[PDB]
Structure formats: C-alpha cells, structure tokens
Design a protein around this ligand. Structure first.
Ligand SMILES: CC(=O)Nc1ccccc1CC(=O)O
Length: 435
C-alpha cells in the first residue's frame, strides 16, 4: 500500500474495522518507513475517535477537537478533510505528504471531493501514495453490502410528514432508531410528531453535528433524526435504521442561481452508508433497515462536483498545472480544468468569503469573480425582485452596515443560504456586515 504511485481503495464493508484496526497498522508502518503522512477525518467527531484508536502513536492533531498539544517530533498529521483543502487554498505551507490517508473517503462535500482530486493527481504524477478508506467507493452500485451481522431489509412507505395513522410500525418499536431525512426542515416535522407521541428525539445536521452528536452518548433517546451527515462514520448504539432514501440536490440553473432540487433518491453509496449504521454487532443479528424508495446516481450534475472544480482551479500544484478530480467521480461535472482559476486578489476574496464569510463555494466564486471585495455587501441587496429571500412568507429584512433597513435580495441566489432558519440567520448577519 505504502509505495509511491499507489492509490489503494480500502473498501472493506461497513464496520469491518478500517478505522479501529487497519488505520493504526498503516500508521505504524508509515512511521517505520519515515513517510510524512496525513490522515484526513471527515468530522471533528471522527478526528476524536481516531485519537483514541491511535492513542500513544506519535500523531500531530491539527484540530481543537483533540486536547493533545503536538510534541514537535511527529511526522504524522491528522486533520479534517475541509482543513486540508482550506490550508491548500491559503498562503500557508502544506508539506508534501508522502502518504495521504482519507477516512470516510466517500464524503461528497466539495472540500472532500477537491482533497481527493489533489491527492489522486499527486499519486498519478508519481509523487505520493494514498489510501482511501470507504465501504462505498464512487459509482458503487450496491446499496446492500455485507455487514458484521445479518440485517433485515424491508422496502416500506416511510413518512416524510407528521402522521396520525397508517405507520404504527414506526412507534411500536422498543429499540433505538436512526432515521435519515432529506433536510433539516423535514427532520423538524418528523421530530415534532415523534416528540408528540412520547418519543425522545435528537436531531443532527452539519451545523449542529459535533455538539448534538454528544447527546447520543450523554442522554437516553429513542430516535436520532439526521440528514446525510451521519453517512460519514457517525456510530450509534441502534437496532433500526429508517431511511427515506431521499436527499436534496444543489443544482446550478443557467450558470446564474443554485436551487435545492428534490427531495430525490439517494445514491447507492449513500443508501449503503445509511444502512451501514446498523448490522455492526456480530452478537446482535436482525437489526432492521426500513427503506422508503429506490436509489439513483443523483451525484450526476450535483453542484458539489462543480464547486470542487472551483476549489481545485485555485490550488497551486505545479506551475500552471491543475489537479483533476479523482477519475471515478470526474464525469459527475461537465467542467474545463482551469475555467475557475482566479487572479491572486480575487482568489484571496474567494477564500475569505468561504472561510470567514461561511458562504457556499458557488456563491463565494460569483462574488469574488465579479471583482467585489470581501466587506462590500451591496450585492446582498441589489438583485432582481425574484431573488427576494422570504422569512415566514414576508421578505427577510436586515439593517445594513449603514443603518438602513433593506430587503434581502442578493444579486446571486444560492438556496443554501436560506435552506433553514439557522442558514438564513447566518446570511442576514453576513448581509449586515457582522462578519
Ligand atoms: C495545536 C497543536 O498542538 N497542533 C497543531 C500543529 C500544527 C498546526 C496546527 C495545530 C493545531 C490546530 O490545527 O488546531
């Protein structure tokens, strides 16, 4: 695995011990061979789990999720997928890692896709080795992979709204259930209906995941209601998964706006990861997977692959060369390598709009490529009437940095900035000049 020019896909089934057994073996071999190594965790939660699995090995934890300060002598770095891509974009030295390990390497957030592109390009160039750890490599067609224990798979209608009757199987269960919903708003309605029926519910989404995930250990619960973020190595003591088999797809229309299309079917990889939350204990056979729809390859034309190209066009590789997407996922977007390469000052703007601005990649790119500076928020207010953002069926309003009340009407509309109350609150704060 550890030889230059090799990319290994460690595609053991879910719970086969890729993180807890195989990763520490790889790290011990890497240190023996003096390979400068990076380990990429999808989340802070997984970063903390890795520290436990690697405890006592010389690993630098480039994350505040782990309260160990680096001794200085480590040649193994551990950071999140997003942190890797972020450091590549910033005017900060990232070492030439000889060995690049990505855990949960199926993660389809733009920074993860970009990280795979950069790493796989380095391996193709003969510069490095890589290991991508995932039960579900890109374009897997198998939603029902092997498990540590037999799973009971049932195709069943799954509610996506509050229900009064017709779904007794949902609440008649005594065990713990992980329920995958297509969106935060959809989870909120299901969570409220379960709470009304006397159930204890924890909700997880990207913005809440570190804080809320701790509740699954610290409090008793009957249901976890989660978006797709729990596909990225989130482990639960559960005996049932309920899977809507639905997700939202960000889609760029006419190069000019992003909508959240769907809900629509998940990929086979997503379905397999959702199911793979259960069947993990060889001593507890007959965990249940209830699924409410089919799969489809809805990553085709999904904005995250175009966003990954926008990141990779803006990462230095060598002279004017630009990293390609990892070959198995490179057809998910129709893009020209280099089309989104920005001049130095616009690139800096692009980076800050993502890092400090917390804007989606696509929207950051529109603003930076227009020659707008990071603090210039006029574009938040000067869009067409149909770009008006609504809050409880009235236009959303903010006080501008000038102290004027204005309707929020961005020049470029990206539905992710108002997908839920928390998103819209953040975007209002941005439009107001508050970060
Ligand atoms: C603070 C620490 O002990 N390790 C480390 C080393 C190098 C760069 C950044 C970090 C921390 C971080 O990225 O949060």
């Amino acid at each position: 695995m550890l030889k230059k020019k090799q990319l290994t896909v460690l595609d053991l089934h879910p719970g086969a011990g890729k993180t807890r057994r195989v990763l520490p073996e790889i790290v011990r071999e890497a240190i023996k061979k003096r390979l400068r190594t990076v380990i990429l965790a999808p989340t802070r939660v997984v970063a903390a789990e890795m520290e436990e699995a690697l405890r006592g090995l010389p690993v630098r934890y480039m994350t505040t999720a782990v309260n160990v300060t680096h001794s200085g002598t480590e040649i193994v770095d551990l950071m999140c997928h997003a942190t890797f891509t972020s450091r590549l974009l910033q005017p900060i030295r990232v070492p030439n890692y000889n060995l690049n390990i990505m855990d949960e390497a199926h993660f389809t957030d733009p920074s993860s896709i970009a990280a795979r592109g950069y790493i796989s390009t380095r391996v193709e160039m003969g510069e490095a080795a890589a290991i991508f750890m995932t039960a579900t490599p890109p374009g897997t067609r198998d939603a029902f992979p092997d498990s540590n224990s037999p799973i009971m798979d049932t195709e069943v209608e799954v509610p996506e709204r509050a229900w009064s009757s017709g779904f007794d199987w949902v609440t008649d269960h005594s065990g713990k259930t992980v329920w995958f919903v297509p969106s935060v708003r959809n989870g909120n309605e299901i969570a409220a209906c379960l709470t009304k029926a006397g159930k204890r519910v924890i909700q997880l989404s990207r913005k809440t995941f570190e804080t809320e995930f701790q509740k699954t250990k610290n409090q008793e619960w009957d249901f976890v209601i989660t978006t797709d973020i729990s596909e990225m190595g989130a482990n639960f003591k559960a005996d049932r998964v309920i899977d809507s088999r639905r997700c939202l797809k960000p889609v760029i229309l006419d190069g000019e706006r992003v909508i959240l299309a769907g809900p629509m079917p998940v990929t086979h990889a997503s379905a397999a990861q959702r199911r793979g939350r259960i069947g993990r204990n060889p001593n507890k056979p007959g965990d249940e997977y209830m699924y409410g729809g089919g799969c489809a390859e809805t990553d085709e034309g999904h904005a995250h692959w175009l966003e990954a190209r926008m990141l990779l066009d803006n990462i230095y590789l060598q002279d004017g060369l630009i990293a390609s997407l990892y070959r198995p996922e490179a057809d998910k977007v129709a893009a020209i390598e280099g089309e989104f390469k920005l001049r130095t000052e616009q690139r800096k703007t692009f980076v800050e709009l993502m890092k400090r601005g917390d804007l989606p990649v696509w929207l950051a790119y529109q603003v930076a490529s227009a020659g707008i500076t990071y603090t210039d928020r006029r574009w938040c207010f000067d869009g067409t009437t149909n770009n008006t953002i609504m809050e409880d069926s009235v236009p959303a309003e903010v006080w501008t940095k000038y102290g004027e009340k204005r309707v929020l009407k961005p020049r470029w509309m990206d539905a992710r900035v108002c997908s839920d109350h928390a998103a819209l609150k953040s975007f209002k704060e941005f439009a107001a000049g508050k970060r």
